Symmetry: C2
């Protein structure tokens, strides 16, 4: 009946439940976002409390809503220095859209109305808004997109574009693709470069260690703003509070998604560095949001989420305990298989790639076909892992226990033992 109306039961910890009684291991944590796992009844209480006390705070008053002030203050403590001014929204997509406007408007204030082009990457994802889909580098997205002033460079995907280079060597090369694009367009027309510290929807593409430092060198060289999209890597996913902290680059601003509330309520934000912030304040355009922005109820729940991620040592636990454990076990489990390679990951994000031949580094034809097939197995065994093309990705709730990790891998191991079984059964060597 539910399927019928749709076409026209529970969650707790890292587990989900169906009406058939079967438990389900959610290795995706909703949409990369449910970082503290499900069943957080103190979040529900924080939401109720706020929706019964003050669910609104109107412009009429000089001040701003307490819960927002309280959230802004807590976030300042967990975010790196120079990000006191935050701009709240309802989603990561809206975050990206907003920062696209802030980026262009900033240069206007700086008396450089030519600097409007943002450079993204192919296979990069930055939301579903028109501007967001334009900044992204997905094909099946490209509403007459992209909009003007949007350019793209190739992604740091060593396995495919690495040739005979070492990852670190390929990191420099891949990063200098940006320099090439900048000189092609003209630095005076380039406003910013935007990238996920790790490409999420693109199949968890982890760039070499040399990549981001080189991207930053180039940005600073040509006076191009550096923007990180923490949509997925945000809030402990890599072990650090933010992806750009792990890879060691400092963006002028960055975008966050509902991971900020572990997906319990819709919310997002753009964190604006001092340099850019003073530019926007000098303009006066986004001053209304730096003050009045943020839905009270969502702020309250988001506050409790952040407070929990820090106070309960969930984030620190990813960097010290469960992260290193997940990476070692992930690599121990998937390195045996004949059609699995490029096993990768950091903190609580992992992935690998289904391949025809590991020796040749030969990918399967019709990139995506074999991935979906492997996904179907995962879904028959009540294990949720996502297939981005022929990439299998993982991103469970950060509070997952070592025991729960082994359990998940145990199931995943079966699925692949079967995957290669079906593979050879269909004649796909």
């Amino acid at each position: 009946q539910w399927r019928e109306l749709d076409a026209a039961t529970r969650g707790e910890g890292v587990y989900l439940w169906d009406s058939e009684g079967n438990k389900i291991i959610d290795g995706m944590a909703g949409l990369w976002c449910v970082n503290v796992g499900y069943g957080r009844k103190d979040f529900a209480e924080a939401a109720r409390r706020q929706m019964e006390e003050l669910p609104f705070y109107n412009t009429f008053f000089k001040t701003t809503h307490p819960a927002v002030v309280e959230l802004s203050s807590l976030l300042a403590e967990v975010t790196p220095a120079g990000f006191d001014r935050v701009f709240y929204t309802n989603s990561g997509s809206e975050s990206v859209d907003t920062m696209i406007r802030m980026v262009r408007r900033y240069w206007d204030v700086q008396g450089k109305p030519e600097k409007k082009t943002l450079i993204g990457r192919w296979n990069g994802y930055h939301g579903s808004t028109i501007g967001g889909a334009s900044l992204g580098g997905m094909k099946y997205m490209h509403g007459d997109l992209p909009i003007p002033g949007m350019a793209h460079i190739e992604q740091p995907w060593w396995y495919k574009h690495g040739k005979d280079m070492t990852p670190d060597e390929f990191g420099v090369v891949a990063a200098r693709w940006l320099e090439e694009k900048i000189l092609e367009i003209g630095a005076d027309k380039v406003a910013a470069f935007v990238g996920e510290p790790i490409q999420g929807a693109g199949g968890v593409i982890v760039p070499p260690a040399t990549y981001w430092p080189e991207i930053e060198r180039i940005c600073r060289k040509y006076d191009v703003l550096l923007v990180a999209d923490e949509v997925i890597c945000g809030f402990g996913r890599t072990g650090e509070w933010f992806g750009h902290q792990h890879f060691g680059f400092q963006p002028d601003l960055f975008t966050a998604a509902k991971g900020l509330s572990s997906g319990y309520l819709p919310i997002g934000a753009v964190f604006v560095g001092k340099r850019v912030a003073e530019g926007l304040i000098a303009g006066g355009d986004f001053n209304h949001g730096f003050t009045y922005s943020g839905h009270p109820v969502c702020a309250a729940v988001a506050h409790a989420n952040v407070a929990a991620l820090r106070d309960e040592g969930i984030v620190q636990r990813v960097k010290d305990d469960i992260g290193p454990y997940m990476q070692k076990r992930w690599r121990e489990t998937f390195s045996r298989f004949e059609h699995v390679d490029d096993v990768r990951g950091v903190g609580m994000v992992q992935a690998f790639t289904l391949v025809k031949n590991k020796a040749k580094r030969e990918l399967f034809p019709d990139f995506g076909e074999i991935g979906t097939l492997c996904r179907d197995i995962f879904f028959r065994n009540n294990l949720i892992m996502r297939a981005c093309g022929d990439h299998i990705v993982s991103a469970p709730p950060l509070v997952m226990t070592r025991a729960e990790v082994d359990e998940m891998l145990a199931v995943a191991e079966r699925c692949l033992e079967e995957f290669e079984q079906t593979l050879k059964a269909r004649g796909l060597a």
Copy 2:
């Protein structure tokens, strides 16, 4: 001044001063404040299942339940809804659907959407482009391609010697002339708020929309209503386009769907367009898996209340007519107030330099801020859109509360007139 509480149509500050909210948050708090039963709906849903995954072949029940409910309050033909987080996202999504739709029909050149100057459709790059705010077209480098604009049906300004009913036909035909200037083969849709809200509650003549609709059909152009404000009982009908009597192919909604208690939005897709998108496959995912359970649960409670408690029906039959009658009885006498207008529970008027010449004050907006500051000093929230003064209080407002709000409002304008003459601006 610190806000402590909200109850019904009032806001209370830290000192105990009562504040009449004549704007209902942002045109959205329709059932009023102090709704503790919604808090329960949210609480319950968030403890049980505050999310849903695409592993199953099902859609979260709370969402299905909401969809099923909305289908009963929306006109026939609107069975499929695409949920979002805000009115802005709805507009942006609607833009992508409209264009994707014509791609399915083999008409890839049919991509230009037409809006109106002084129109408002969110704050996203696409929404701002479709909107007609000039102070908003420069920032962000707007508008984006495939976006055009026609003049607004503002009679007081562009009415000349025509009667409103005649002006309504002329204003509507601006759409046709634009379509022909661009070429019908390039026009994907026309988009408009049934009543321009942020523009200053611009109520078009009764002849406007019916003519707009005829033109859209004539040139095979999609018609899109933006119910960001008129939605959910504002005009007395569940949706503005119902009041003015036109059937859009899709319409967008904002957090009024949950009375602003939680961020939520939706795109309502008619038969024609829905069937089209399904043939594509681009959006088929969101017609089922889109929507946040908690927000959906609070929306369900809001919509259920709006209907089951006769709140909307009451606007149409009781407080609406009363509000309009009283609104006009109150402001008609003032020398520098004209174009007293409104319907249901959205009203407005315009501060003018001289009613005779229909002359407006210079620097449209300077005088609106002056008058607005008076409302605020007296703990009354009514918005100023230029020299336009607008009002859209909670639909559950009682008659006595209407009289109270109008009493203070009249007091503020008596002052306005005096400070106008004192400053030699009469």
